[PDB]
Design a binder for this molecule. Structure first.
Ligand code: ADP
Ligand code: MG
Length: 213
């Protein structure tokens, strides 16, 4: 039968919305750091599953090997970052990815308008939004041991949606799908991806694998 999914729309916190507009509509050099930020978030999620384990082993589910996979798709013009980390519940998506204020957001915008490099974004507590330096749309599929699978999505414009994902089960973890802008297709190339992982993510404590078509 036909599947049905409930969709909820949310407004980004005021300053997060301002930061996204700034990011999308201003030229910045060194945009490649978006990958470092996404890999760091996967690394953090993998640390969480590691610390959640041994303590409470009787609640372990999905995935198996703790790792990060990078999957560029030239045909679809997408770059996907997949991890087997802890994942996020529906409440986590809503709270952590848009609705709650970050104390460093205003400071970061002030810094950028005065010439700071976008690379500092991670240190101001808003690293995820660096995804919009290269993506026109971002989809996040996630599955946490304590909830069902959900899909978060935003093309900016001040709001994002969250819905139950009835599509292919992904197992415990998170998948960030970047729909790359027309002028940012260099990030689909094997050599370029290897270059930036070596330059900015050469110390992550988990296996990172690049799948090349
Ligand atoms: N791969 C992921 N797995 C689980 N949670 C994630 C993932 N990526 C982002 N998140 C959530 O989004 C929040 C915001 O990330 P970010 O903007 O990079 O800030 P920070 O890493 O400083 O918390 C993270 O704290 C985490 O709760
Ligand atoms: Mg981060």
């Amino acid at each position: 039968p036909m599947e049905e999914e409930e969709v909820e729309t949310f407004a980004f916190q005021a300053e997060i919305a301002q930061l996204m507009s700034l990011i999308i509509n201003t030229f910045y050099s060194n945009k490649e750091i978006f990958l470092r930020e996404l890999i760091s978030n996967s690394s953090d999620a993998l640390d969480k599953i590691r610390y959640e384990t041994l303590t409470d082993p009787s609640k372990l589910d999905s995935g198996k090997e703790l790792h990060i996979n990078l999957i560029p798709n030239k045909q679809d013009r997408t770059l996907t970052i997949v991890d087997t980390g802890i994942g996020m519940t529906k409440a986590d998506l809503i709270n952590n990815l848009g609705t709650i204020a970050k104390s460093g957001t205003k400071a970061f915008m002030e810094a950028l308008q005065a010439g700071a490099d976008i690379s500092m974004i991670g240190q101001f507590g808003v690293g995820f939004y660096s995804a919009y330096l290269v993506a026109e749309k971002v989809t996040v599929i996630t599955k946490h041991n304590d909830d069902e699978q959900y899909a978060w999505e935003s093309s900016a414009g001040g709001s994002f949606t969250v819905r139950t994902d009835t599509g292919e089960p992904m197992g415990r973890g998170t998948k960030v799908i970047l729909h790359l802008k027309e002028d940012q297709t260099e990030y689909l190339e094997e050599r370029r991806i290897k270059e930036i992982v070596k330059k900015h993510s050469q110390f992550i404590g988990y296996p990172i694998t690049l799948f090349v078509e």
